[PDB]
Amino acid sequence: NGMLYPQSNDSRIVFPLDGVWDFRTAGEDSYPAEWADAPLPEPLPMAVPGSYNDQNDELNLRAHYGWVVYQRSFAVPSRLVAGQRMILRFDAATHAADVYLNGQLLGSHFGGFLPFEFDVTSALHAGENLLTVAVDNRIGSSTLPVGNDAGTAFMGSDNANVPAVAEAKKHARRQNLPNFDFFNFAGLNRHVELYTTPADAYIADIAITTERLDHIAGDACTAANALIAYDVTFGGDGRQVRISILDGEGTVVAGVTADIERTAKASGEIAIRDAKLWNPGAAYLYTAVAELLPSRIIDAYRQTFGIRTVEVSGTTFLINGKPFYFKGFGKHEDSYFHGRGTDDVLNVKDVSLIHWLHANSFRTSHYPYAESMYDLCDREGIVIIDEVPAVGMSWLQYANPLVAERHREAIRGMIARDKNHPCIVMWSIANEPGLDGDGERPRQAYDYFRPLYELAHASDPQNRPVTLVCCQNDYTTDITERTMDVVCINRYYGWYNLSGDLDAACHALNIELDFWENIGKPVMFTEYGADTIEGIHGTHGEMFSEEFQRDYYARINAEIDKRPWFIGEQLWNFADFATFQGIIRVEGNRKGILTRDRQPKMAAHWLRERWAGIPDYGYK
Amino acid sequence: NGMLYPQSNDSRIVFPLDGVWDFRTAGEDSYPAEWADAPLPEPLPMAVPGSYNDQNDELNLRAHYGWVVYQRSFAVPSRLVAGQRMILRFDAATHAADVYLNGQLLGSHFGGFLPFEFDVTSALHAGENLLTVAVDNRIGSSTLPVGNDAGTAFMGSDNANVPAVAEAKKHARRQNLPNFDFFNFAGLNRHVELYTTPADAYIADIAITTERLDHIAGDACTAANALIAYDVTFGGDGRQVRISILDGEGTVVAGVTADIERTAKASGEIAIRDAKLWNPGAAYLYTAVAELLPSRIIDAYRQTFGIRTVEVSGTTFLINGKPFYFKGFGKHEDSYFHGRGTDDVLNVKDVSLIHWLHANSFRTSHYPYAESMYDLCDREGIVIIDEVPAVGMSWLQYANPLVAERHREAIRGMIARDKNHPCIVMWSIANEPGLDGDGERPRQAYDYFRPLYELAHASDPQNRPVTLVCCQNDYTTDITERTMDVVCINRYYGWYNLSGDLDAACHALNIELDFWENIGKPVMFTEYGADTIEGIHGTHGEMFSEEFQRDYYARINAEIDKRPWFIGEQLWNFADFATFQGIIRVEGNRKGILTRDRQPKMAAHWLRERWAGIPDYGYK
Ligand SMILES: O=C(O)[C@H]1CNC[C@@H](O)[C@@H]1O
Ligand SMILES: O=C(O)[C@H]1CNC[C@@H](O)[C@@H]1O
């Protein structure tokens, strides 16, 4: 279950395998087996990590349907593999992968946004090793995220009653049709690395929780006492682990030696006096150093954490007992050449833009992001809502056992990967599933999602709030969204309805806010916005102008400011991003307040001024 | 019934009333009638001709619903009104107008794109006269062009099932909702002028027809003999009219004196030896001078015309007996500040761009254009399909007698205004009405449109072909389009359906072409295209890129080149133009091959090279 990010220390070394690999496209539903057994014939270069789709302009890899095959060679000194346990980790392969080393199948994985690994201790040999990775991009009614098996991509146009169209559909080239509004970027989107651990006994997992804070300071910077809990899991085979707690300067401030008991596990609690708390806008990180003891150390791992509590109380969202207000947006992992490929230069820039805007938060719309972004937000004081790739779902998916299992895998896998981050304050178990309607449909949706809500709570040792991000719907027949811990709504009054009429949009919004006012839950926007082409201007801004986007937020935000139970504003989107092509997507989704190259539109400046005057705590 | 354009000569003077008028907005359903008795209070300036909507950025006149009121003063010498018949002509007031002169209601008019006039001989007086014109912009289920009484505009977004939206709609500000894809520009869109004729007896109407051509030259530049016919109508009260035919140099080549008989008319035929024929790309104009005789001349009018025949024969469209192929586009009267206002600088530029592109034709989508444009196309050898404002129609309109009468008025009024232009080769009685479906709907549409097809044929002395421009539909249950003289189809395979997939688009197109192959009529595109933002580029062009637009025409045109019965390609659109705001309109409609400022996108250059190689005659 543990998926600790690979670390190098006195006991452990990481050997990255990123770089320019060999690559070939393959078939709609197969690829040649012999490509795992010998060097790829006539290979193309392909950089990893990165989506493959925008890395070759001679081919139209955006249109590719099915498999591709990556390959590279590598060699490491026998000295450093001798006696060690050898693990090959894929941070992400989107969506499914088969992995081979030296002509041997290592195994496969489904799930394009979470890491997986293989023990290669026995498949490795000295000299050059040949690593082959086949990656499948296909999506459909059984995948998360969901594809459409026929018809159109999400918000695509059709003339389905025209006989010629119906007939041409039967013979059209197979293409993935996302039931979600972002491009289906595929390939080795995140890092690949070989790493070592000791073989006889090793640290497999660590969970740190903030159990209780006694007497939090008025400014929330410290607490008189913090009770933290640790849970260390071991692999391999009267043994002990030493746990040292280091503060922000590396000083040892606490330490215990705990007994390992047979899963081999050690768990306990540690009191940290005068603890320095983690807050939005004021991060503070500790390190838990776990050392497996035999003066010598057998194994070690350093786990960053921050001390803070999260609690929903009535219509408030309390961080360290203080009423928080979210300011931010949904993001995407999306950029020009990389596609969905992780890029830490861009992550660093985006975090600085979050600060420039005076925002404090975002959601990982619509899939878990690369692990390095959460470390960055841990150090930079930015709060995250962590979301699984359960986007595009409807009643067709609720009746499918395979989908339900993939959904539980994604929830368990996201929380197992991300549980130690102090920046994560809430889990989202889906984006815009179908919840409303007549007959049994609302109850069917509820019966599908309630066990997943329970699973997210059971899986997280911090027991953080759980939400489900709700599409614009008939809120009077949806019986699911109102049962979440925080109500997170996506609304486009004045854009997809009441188009351009901000008076009517605000009237409609206020009618629905009157509905939520009586529910007793904290409510926030997780999306709202307007497609905007930079450089389109008007004195009376119409849809797609920079002025209309600014006016849109000015009018809507004035209405939610009147509601004390409305605890956050996350807009859509941080920045323009790529989508499947169609008649409503002008080079992708243009609801960004920043352009795809991260330049600010008029509305970004307006928002920056607004958010500069809204405090993280106590706004409401 | 005659609407001869006002002419100045020895018997007649025109006094233009264009300029900067006074203007006020008025109510949704009313205006103060006392404004006609005195100068408007606190007036704004408003230039005439021109739409009013983009002439004031302090007010939001694009949002205006209902009435506005124009006013100006004028004075003419008593010496020149004395004894004369005084006519006040509005070339176009969009959509409906009440006209007052010195407080007296002259009358009212409804069609927004055709001229109307009043006899003001008795309402004029010496010194300053006060002209007040109330103009109504409202559209709805009883107007042509059609508006929607509730819901959304054409291709608008909605979330009708959200209770807050339904409730907000009931209280939203009233707004015109076009059921057509262009902005509802209103006001005194075309010129206003006072003109004089003799009062006792005057020329009221002139119709010139090309009756027969004998021994047409191989190059169609001449015929050994041409038989033309004239029909002159007189108003007022052994009288005679002299008809002189002037060639391009002003030489009188033929001439006849005809007897006037009682409604006062003179008619006959005139033989013209070695007649020089009007052709696309090679215009030649004669002048028919009609002089009412008492040595003196009582009245005179000079009517331009061109000698050519138009005939549909099987699957060919014959001009002067040669098989013509249409190259061109739908247009709009649309430009930045003028709106739908006529602008002769822009007309002159646009005709030069038609030549630059090597096009030979356009359609007056979706309303009759300003009279000056047809005069320009007569002189520049550009063929026109002339279309009435019957756009946005469906079964709701077919049972509405007010609509039917407005539709007949527009057909009669367009042909009465435009019958003498040689450049007009075909009449269009509607754009994209509802024609298909099940039950009685296809027959209901046929029973509505067939009397209008006959009306157009009975109204035109030249008996030119009549069509109806067909929207993308289920061509197998449409029973009306296939009965037109030329089948004119609008198709967006690969844009609004099969989106982005040009292989599937061409397959679907070919399936439909196979259907039309068996119908045995000549067929042409009147629309096809793809929204394109200039400056959006890709190596594999996706929707909205310049490359996709180029590839779209390249692929579609290769398929129609294989069909001998496919006689023309008019694409959509000549240039980007304004629409009601909505989620599929990026600053309007962007299917122009030119930008709104008339600059060429990539596809315009490609089309220019294609069309350079396609002859007007004998391509198929
Ligand atoms: O339509 C939109 O702009 C947004 C609607 N909510 C879901 C987003 O993924 C999508 O991008
Ligand atoms: O959708 C479009 O782009 C066109 C479809 N046919 C009618 C045009 O007025 C309209 O502009």
Residue numbers in the entry:
A (entry chain A), B (entry chain D): -1 to 235, 274 to 298, 303 to 334, 342 to 667
From the paper:
However, intestinal bacterial GUSs cleave the attached glucuronic acid for use as a carbon source, allowing potentially toxic compounds to re-enter the enterohepatic circulation. However, microflora-encoding β-glucuronidases (GUSs) are notorious for reversing the glucuronidation to release SN-38 in the intestinal lumen and thus represent the major cause of undesirable effects. GUS contains a deep enzyme active site (the two catalytic glutamates lie ~12 Å below the protein surface). To understand the underlying structural basis, we prepared C6-propyl, -hexyl, and -nonyl UIFGs (2–4, respectively) and resolved the eight X-ray crystal structures of 1–4 bound to EcGUS or Bifidobacterium dentium GUS (BdGUS).
Uronic isofagomine (UIFG, 1) potently inhibits both mammalian and bacterial GUSs, owing to ionic interactions between the protonated ring nitrogen and the two catalytic glutamates. Inhibitor 1 appeared to be potent for both human and bacterial GUSs (e.g., Ki = 180 nM for HsGUS, 16 nM for EcGUS, 7.4 nM for BdGUS, 6.5 nM for CpGUS). Because the resolutions of the four structures for BdGUS (1.7–2.4 Å) were higher than those for EcGUS (2.5–3.2 Å), water molecules could be visualized in the catalytic site. Seven highly coordinated water molecules (I–VII) clustered in the active site of BdGUS/1 and formed an H-bond network with the inhibitor. Water molecules I–III were conserved in all of the BdGUS structures and located near the UIFG-binding moiety to mediate interactions between the inhibitor and certain residues. In contrast, molecules VI–VII were located near the aglycone-binding moiety. Asn636 and Lys638, characterized as a unique conserved N–K motif in loop 833, provided hydrogen bonds (H-bonds) and electrostatic interactions, respectively, with the C5-carboxylate of inhibitors 1–4. The other conserved residues were categorized into two groups depending on whether they formed direct or indirect H-bonds with the hydroxyl groups of the bound inhibitor. The former group (including Arg632, Asp179, and Tyr543) interacted directly with the C5-carboxylate and C4-hydroxyl groups of the inhibitors, whereas the latter (His379, His413, and Asn478) formed water-mediated H-bonds with the C3-OH and Glu574. Additionally, Trp619 provided a hydrophobic contact with one face of the iminocyclitol ring. The potent inhibition of 1 was contributed mainly by enthalpy (ΔH = –10.47 and –9.12 kcal mol−1 for BdGUS and EcGUS, respectively).
